[PDB]
Ligand binder design. Structure first.
Ligand SMILES: C[As](C)(=O)[O-]
Ligand SMILES: C[As](C)(=O)[O-]
Ligand SMILES: C[As](C)(=O)[O-]
Ligand SMILES: C[As](C)(=O)[O-]
Ligand SMILES: [Zn+2]
Ligand SMILES: [Zn+2]
Ligand SMILES: [Zn+2]
Ligand SMILES: [Zn+2]
Ligand SMILES: [Zn+2]
Ligand SMILES: [Zn+2]
Ligand SMILES: [Zn+2]
Ligand SMILES: [Zn+2]
Ligand SMILES: [Zn+2]
Ligand SMILES: [Zn+2]
Ligand SMILES: [Zn+2]
Ligand SMILES: [Zn+2]
Lengths: 343, 343, 342, 342
């Protein structure tokens, strides 16, 4: 081997360790285009901590050639995953017509029983295994071409205990309708690649792109750690430049992303130095404020960059709230995180 | 020398030649950080056709060291510009407090007379030279920190014949308020770099970024050609992934950006092949349509890439209007170009 | 979503320069991608032809990938066609050294090459009139100290079972093979032998490219490619090196540079030299008239115009501007010699 | 908006590796950027120290850039300080060959080096106790055929006016200078001699870096740097090459690689070799026990862990895994020799 890892530099919330996970992907054992061990190589290289090779149960177009059961791609990844310190969550993709559409069952013990005639029996087996289940690409236009709706089956599934999360972001597809669903129904927001091609084929790493993924705030770096995080919705989806999650999580995360220090002060205002200590670009937009409190209208804090920020005091003011939205920290559809720097 | 040019691959409107211009930049002869010939090297390399080194009249912080008049940086660029086939428009930046703020006077014959005590006399000299004049960075938060307004002086200036355009985009600053101004007041939409640093220092070319600039649709590649285009508002600002301009210009431009061909048809629908023949990424978003006409919800046509697009016919339909907004072809603030592919 | 990155290199007079990769693997042997991926990659890299050459003898996925020796090729035909990629059927005869490993291309059937005796694997290929070349002769796993030519190789060569040698494979450069081809009248080949996804082995961010072969053909067809290979109308493109016989490399260089006299006086000449290609060209001054003053070394970056001055000392009025194109290998440790006569 | 790209290279025991560029220009001579830009660039490139060394004799912008010889340095002090960049005052004595061009650094005043006789320019620098080195000895504009050592150079050297030679300048590599330093007990230096904006001459997209000097110091201070230069505790970092005396390069390599024995049996040993640096390392097998079977050639990419197997043939139980670190130049055309004893 020739092993190189590019760590994903993001912080940890107090009490938790931030794990980078991809809970949805494919190999040639379904409709994917790579041998399963490649998914392990890619995760390693990309600084991921955990993955789930979630083959389609119902869709295996290579089956005349690639002859196996539903547990086989997982089996093939185990040694590699161990050697490279990647956590491997057994899972599968229950692929059906809309509704209910496509769901992933992860933390399975056995994939085979998920092959059933009736979709309902498919979900009953996964449930029986106590699987963590989430709705995939609700918004995929192939199944919902005009509008991303919630069907009576999703309601059923959700009441049966067969929906624990929803993908709010899949590959290059962002689905805000799902954000509101997770908020209203108390579900875990998920983000995955749903990779079929080689990873490099779908992400222009050259341009600093990254695979859509999920930040999991775990009490420990183990299978159980991840599961407990997911059970408790202690996640955020990382998509392009967006980070999607509950405010109660994004707020403290943002606080860890920047190092704000008062460099100076006087009668005329305050001088700060704000440093982005992450790999994540941060985009700030001024919000309602005291007009006598003079600062930026817009501001982009690039990764690992320190900025000098002057806040002016007009008329007589001695301080105040430097208010802004972190536009790319999505706490609700079309709503970015609100933050204040009190001076 | 060692000369390499990276052409900007965009089309030409019928009757016109598309020229790529930067009408606002700086050298060490004001507050810029490079020798003037560098601006010529950069333009060449970046596939530009024309530039204007527009030094501040009032602000020259290097003056103890760099001793000259206001025509000198232009003078120094002439030979290089000629050798490299770059068109050099003499200009300057009338730098004042808000209001009226900062304006560029281009197509000057002599920069020196623009140095006057009263700003009004500054504009009267530029006018006297029949200069093409535009308002710079109306939105720059340093001078308008809370809101981008139109002052009574801009009204005056505009009625005196001292405003022919407005920058709708400056460097990494997008100012939509200006779009509406140009639309209401019939002005030329401009986009510039306002470069002070070396060009590579402010644009991550690695990530395929490009200097903010202006597409000028000229009847000829000459100084007069450009001037006639500008006089007639035959421009579009190119900013990041956005192209900003009047619909009557963007519509036919988009039509030249894609090559749509019907690959096939039947009772079930139509198969198209759409190719982006430009360096510009194109972003399509489905709009109001016949629901029986099944197609994408969202779609990104990357540069120089061919896509196969299937349009389905539900119930009995034999065709219709494949409607979508080109979200990054801005025809009005917050309003993208509307387009239809009739089948 | 299809995007092609054309390889901008010139055409010699009377021929079309085809970019080909005659050695590669998929899951159907010991590669790591579905076969259709090799066609996609080829299209994207601006290639014209490929051969998916699965090992006959080494199929470590066969318990899962149950198909025969013809299957990966079969699975690529449609795609190749849709994307304009010529698909040459081949296989890799994979044995112990000697003879080592050989590619057999322009096959009609891969299945019969599965034989107990290596010589029978070769007779089957020969019976199909295959174009056969010796792979990675220098691979350290089989020749760990010296790249040697073995009796088995003489014999295969004498039996009409060696038409080419790989001079470059992946990231491995094997000069010993250059001399062999030169001495034996064989086709120098450059291939990738890709097993990983292509992007995993080549850093395209850095201007790297798959090792490949420039094939100078009379037509963009399977038949056109074969006639070129049969007659050694090839060059191996490896990293920054272009490797081939001098009678090809010389006119090729000529086509890579646009030289113009911009000016002349008593003091010398000013030339403009433009590199109209994607290839970097490295020049180094060789023996010359010392009164003819020019560069010592010079690198011509792709698609870049250079202004070059030649001084005339004492009373000289002209002369031979002599240099070596160091990355244009015409023989082991020998670059193309060239003159600009002024 | 400040972003620093640290150069990740190791520290030798007892010293701190400083990255320095002792040769560069601005608009105050024949460079093309305002001086403050050189400080910004240095910070961004992960450098620790620079010297803006304007030509004394060649100031083609002086009709516009009217200031004295101390001014560009002066203009950079504040910025340098704000950004933690050590600023060494210097100038370039720019003459015809011989003696050619020399940098004088650790100056107190640049103004007095402006003299009619070159020897007086040097006496002024020497009077200030400057560290003096010969620039681009191999520059083809002044030595177009051969890089020669001239009597003027012997004389400057004997007069205590040559403490170093540039072995690497910008994109120019000059091996002749390596032997000279070795023979004369001088400091090998690598500089950029940047005139353009830095990005214009280096393709960072491709992993290129400014030519520079690794300085092994006892403190991150002007005084620390000087003591290092005085005692030749340097290496020149040029493209993929690191050039320096063997007594520095050997422990430096040792620090670049983390070697571990992962396993051993009768059949051999499996090692893991990690390159913990930003530097690419190129290994080539040298003379060895032929019963000790290992790689022929191997390239260790930055921040990459390699699994390497050493086979034991016949009855061998261990041995010397001998190779050359080809990009670690200890002498002209000589790479660092190294052994891993198993
Ligand atoms: C994006 As799929 C074919 O895994 O549903
Ligand atoms: C952005 As300016 C200092 O040219 O107004
Ligand atoms: C490099 As191979 C396994 O094709 O001999
Ligand atoms: C390369 As120079 C003009 O500093 O001698
Ligand atoms: Zn799938
Ligand atoms: Zn799915
Ligand atoms: Zn899927
Ligand atoms: Zn300015
Ligand atoms: Zn301004
Ligand atoms: Zn300006
Ligand atoms: Zn193989
Ligand atoms: Zn092989
Ligand atoms: Zn092979
Ligand atoms: Zn110079
Ligand atoms: Zn010099
Ligand atoms: Zn110099």
């Amino acid at each position: 081997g020739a092993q190189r890892r590019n760590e994903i530099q993001v912080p940890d919330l107090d009490g938790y360790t931030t794990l980078k996970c991809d809970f949805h992907m494919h190999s040639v054992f379904s409709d994917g285009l790579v041998w399963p061990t490649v998914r392990v190589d890619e995760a390693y290289r990309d600084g991921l901590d955990a993955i789930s090779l979630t083959e389609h149960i119902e869709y295996r177009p290579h089956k005349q050639d690639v002859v196996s059961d539903h547990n086989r791609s997982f089996d093939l990844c185990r040694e590699q995953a161990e050697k490279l310190g990647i956590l491997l969550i057994k899972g599968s993709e229950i692929t059906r017509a809309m509704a209910p559409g496509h769901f992933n069952a992860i933390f399975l013990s056995d994939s085979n029983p998920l092959e059933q005639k009736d979709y309902k029996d498919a979900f009953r087996e996964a449930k029986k295994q106590g699987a963590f289940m989430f709705w995939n690409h609700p918004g995929w236009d192939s199944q919902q071409p005009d509008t991303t709706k919630w069907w009576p089956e999703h309601t059923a599934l959700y009441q049966e205990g067969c929906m624990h999360g929803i993908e709010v972001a899949n590959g290059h597809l962002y689905m805000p309708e799902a954000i509101q669903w997770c908020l209203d129904k108390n579900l875990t927001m998920i983000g995955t690649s749903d990779i079929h091609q080689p990873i490099q084929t779908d992400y222009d790493f050259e341009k600093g792109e990254h695979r859509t993924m999920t930040f999991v705030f775990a009490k420990e770096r183990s299978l159980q750690g991840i599961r407990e995080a997911l059970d408790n919705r202690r996640t955020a989806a990382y998509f392009h430049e967006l980070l999607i999650g509950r405010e109660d999580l994004l707020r403290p995360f943002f606080e860890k992303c920047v190092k704000i220090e008062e460099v100076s002060r006087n009668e005329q205002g305050v001088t700060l130095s704000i440093t982005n200590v992450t790999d994540l670009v941060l985009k700030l937009k001024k919000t309602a404020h005291d007009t006598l409190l003079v600062y930026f209208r817009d501001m982009t804090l690039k990764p690992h960059t320190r900025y000098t920020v002057r806040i002016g005091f007009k008329q007589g003011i001695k301080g105040g709230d430097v208010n802004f939205e972190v536009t790319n920290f999505i706490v609700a559809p079309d709503k970015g995180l609100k933050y204040t720097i009190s001076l």
